[PDB]
Amino acid sequence: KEIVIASNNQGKINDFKVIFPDYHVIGISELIPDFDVEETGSTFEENAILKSEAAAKALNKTVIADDSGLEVFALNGEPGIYSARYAGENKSDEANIEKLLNKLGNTTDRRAQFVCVISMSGPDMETKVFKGTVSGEIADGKYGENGFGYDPIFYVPKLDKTMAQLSKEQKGQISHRRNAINLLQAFLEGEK
Amino acid sequence: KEIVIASNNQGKINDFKVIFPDYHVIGISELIPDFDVEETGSTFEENAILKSEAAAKALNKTVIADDSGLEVFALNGEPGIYSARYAGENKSDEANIEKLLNKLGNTTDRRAQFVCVISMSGPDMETKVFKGTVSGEIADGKYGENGFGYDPIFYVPKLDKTMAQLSKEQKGQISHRRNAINLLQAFLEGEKNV
């Protein structure tokens, strides 16, 4: 009946209420207000697993965490697990965008991907990982006004648009996150 | 550990063997050499369901089937469900490619998408379907010689290669069929009691 989200994002949590409408969906802050997990991992997957396992082992409940980011091929994976605070600790997207555009710069191979890993851990269960991806190219500079993070510089060839130029619903169709959620839903459907 | 695949396409069976290395993959041609289901569906999903349900009823086993195709933007989704027999009923991959290329003679927006729908059917479950896709562009000619079907003209920008240029292992990491099967395998993992 209950499922907890290792996140402080009411957006994500409400999203999860639709995919767990059979469940009571609870934000982690309701159970561990001071939840704080040291992200000592190397990949999005390791960091997702640390978050969901810390909550699940302390709580004896089923919990979902995630971790997301941009990987740019020419920069050997950067910003990677450092996507949010790429250019500094006050996590300014524009600052992040400017550091990325400047480090890439003249480079012709601008191939990149967004990856979202969703982790699910619990007592009667081994921890499960669901990885979604969406591919594209780093643009010339910023283009578009919707979305956030690196969306203005992430060009999507199959749509001829940056992620920022897409509507929210358009983003919701093709995003790395939608891909990870599809994998989760298939698992959930699986247990019936 | 066995999976029966209700497909007559030997190329598909090969891909499936790459994607299920822990399974004994059994192609329908081993069990019913003249398997022949009338694909009267108007979508990939309908065609896949017809194949999986037909094999499952005749064998009283769980099986999977596959109906896949290529949708080219500039042709508003052609060849689509007609992908296999695009150029005629003899189902010549080479003829299908030539037709598609001719029809795109000068076109500059060559965006296309590979689509794969997997359906699972069995005597103890309602039929279930899973869809995978991969994006690319139609090249100006045939490059590479691995794979099958439209592989030699399906250029994958992510990889700077056509599907036919990729090793069987690499194709299996990124194909539309790999993506559909990931949803399937997640489904199977879900039925092992969470």
Of B150, B121, B123, give the one whose Cα is nearest residue B138. B150
Count other Cβ atoms within 10 Å, centred on residue B51: 26
Of B109, B120, B110, give the one whose Cα is nearest residue B155. B110
- Contact (CB, 8 A) for B31 and B59: yes
CA distances from residue A174 to A62, A66, A84, B105 in whole angstroms, order as listed: 27, 18, 21, 29
Cα Dmax for chain B? 54
Contact A184 B186 (CB under 8 A): yes
Which residues fall within 8 angstroms of residue B56, CB to CB, at 6 or more apart? B6, B62, B63, B121, B122, B123
Tell me which residue in A122, A158, A187 faces B190 most closely, judged by beta carbons.
A187
In the structure encoding, which two tokens stand for residue B36, read together? 């022949």
Of A129, A162, A143, give the one whose Cα is nearest residue A45. A129
The angle subtended at Cα B181 by Cα B176 and Cα B187, nearest 5°, is 140
Structure solved via: X-ray
The CATH code of domain A1-192 reads 3.90.950.10
Of A69, A34, A68, A24, give the one whose Cα is nearest residue A54. A34
- Contact (CB, 8 A) for B79 and B97: no
Contact B187 A186 (CB under 8 A): yes
Instruction: Please tell me the distance from the alpha carbon of residue A165 to that of residue A142, in angstroms, as a whole number.
Output: 10
* B193: Cα separation from own chain's centroid: 29
- Contact (CB, 8 A) for A158 and B135: yes
Of B93, B75, B66, give the one whose Cα is nearest residue B148. B93
The CATH code of domain B1-194 reads 3.90.950.10
Which residues fall within 8 angstroms of residue A20, CB to CB, at 6 or more apart? A3, A188
The DSSP secondary structure of B57-87, one letter per residue, reads HHHTS-EEEEEEEEEEGGGTTEEGGGGGGTT
Instruction: Please tell me the distance from the alpha carbon of residue A112 to that of residue A75, in angstroms, as a whole number.
Output: 9
Of B66, B61, B68, B67, give the one whose Cα is nearest residue B3. B61
Instruction: Please tell me the distance from the alpha carbon of residue B57 to that of residue A144, in angstroms, as a whole number.
Output: 52
Instruction: Give the per-residue SS3 of A66-123.
Output: EEEEEEEHHHCCCEHHHCCCCCCCCCCHHHHHHHHHHHHCCCCCCEEEEEEEEEEEEC
Interface of B with A (CB under 8 A): 111, 113, 128, 130, 135, 137, 157-158, 182-184, 186-191, 193-194
In the structure encoding, which two tokens stand for residue A81, read together? 């697990």
Instruction: Please tell me the distance from the alpha carbon of residue B146 to that of residue B135, in angstroms, as a whole number.
Output: 19
β-bridge mates for residue A154, sequence order: A138
Residue type at A141?
G
- Contact (CB, 8 A) for B142 and B164: yes
Instruction: Please tell me the distance from the alpha carbon of residue A74 to that of residue A76, in angstroms, as a whole number.
Output: 5
Instruction: Please tell me the distance from the alpha carbon of residue A184 to that of residue A177, in angstroms, as a whole number.
Output: 11
Chain B positions in Cβ-Cβ contact with residue A191 (cut-off 8 Å):
190-191, 193-194
CB-facing half-sphere around the CA of A11: CA atoms within 13 A: 3
Contact A125 B194 (CB under 8 A): yes
Chain A positions in Cβ-Cβ contact with residue B135 (cut-off 8 Å):
135, 157-158
Chain B positions in Cβ-Cβ contact with residue A187 (cut-off 8 Å):
186-187, 189-190
Of A152, A157, A191, give the one whose Cα is nearest residue A174. A157
For the stretch A42-45, contacts whose Cβ atoms lie closer than 8 Å and that sit 24 or more positions apart, written own/partner, are A42/A81, A43/A80, A43/A81, A43/A117, A44/A68, A44/A69, A44/A80, A44/A81, A44/A115, A44/A116, A44/A117, A45/A117, A45/A119, A45/A129, A45/A131
Q: What are phi and psi of B11, to 5 degrees?
A: -65, -50
* Smallest Cα distance from A186 to chain B, Å: 5
* Smallest Cα distance from A174 to chain B, Å: 11
Three-state SS for A136?
strand
Q: How many CB pairs under 8 A join A and B?
A: 52
Instruction: Please tell me the distance from the alpha carbon of residue B11 to that of residue B67, in angstroms, as a whole number.
Output: 13
In the structure encoding, which two tokens stand for residue B185, read together? 């395998």
Of A114, A117, A112, give the one whose Cα is nearest residue A44. A117
Contact A191 B188 (CB under 8 A): no
* Smallest Cα distance from A183 to chain B, Å: 5
Chain B positions in Cβ-Cβ contact with residue A190 (cut-off 8 Å):
186-191
Instruction: Please tell me the distance from the alpha carbon of residue B29 to that of residue B23, in angstroms, as a whole number.
Output: 17
Of B156, B174, B43, B141, give the one whose Cα is nearest residue A158. B156
Instruction: Please tell me the distance from the alpha carbon of residue A190 to that of residue A142, in angstroms, as a whole number.
Output: 41
* Smallest Cα distance from A11 to chain B, Å: 25
Residue type at B60?
N
Instruction: Please tell me the distance from the alpha carbon of residue B149 to that of residue B170, in angstroms, as a whole number.
Output: 17
CA distances from residue A164 to A53, A79, A111, A143, A188 in whole angstroms, order as listed: 33, 19, 17, 7, 31
DSSP single-letter state for residue B88: -
Of the residues A34, A36, A67, A160, only one is catalytic, namely A67
β-bridge mates for residue B64, sequence order: B5, B120
β-bridge mates for residue B24, sequence order: B2
CA distances from residue A100 to A43, A79, A86, B48, B124 in whole angstroms, order as listed: 19, 8, 8, 44, 53
Contact B186 A183 (CB under 8 A): yes
Chain B positions in Cβ-Cβ contact with residue A125 (cut-off 8 Å):
193-194
CB-facing half-sphere around the CA of B185: CA atoms within 13 A: 17
Contact A190 B193 (CB under 8 A): no
Residue of B nearest to A188 (CA): B190
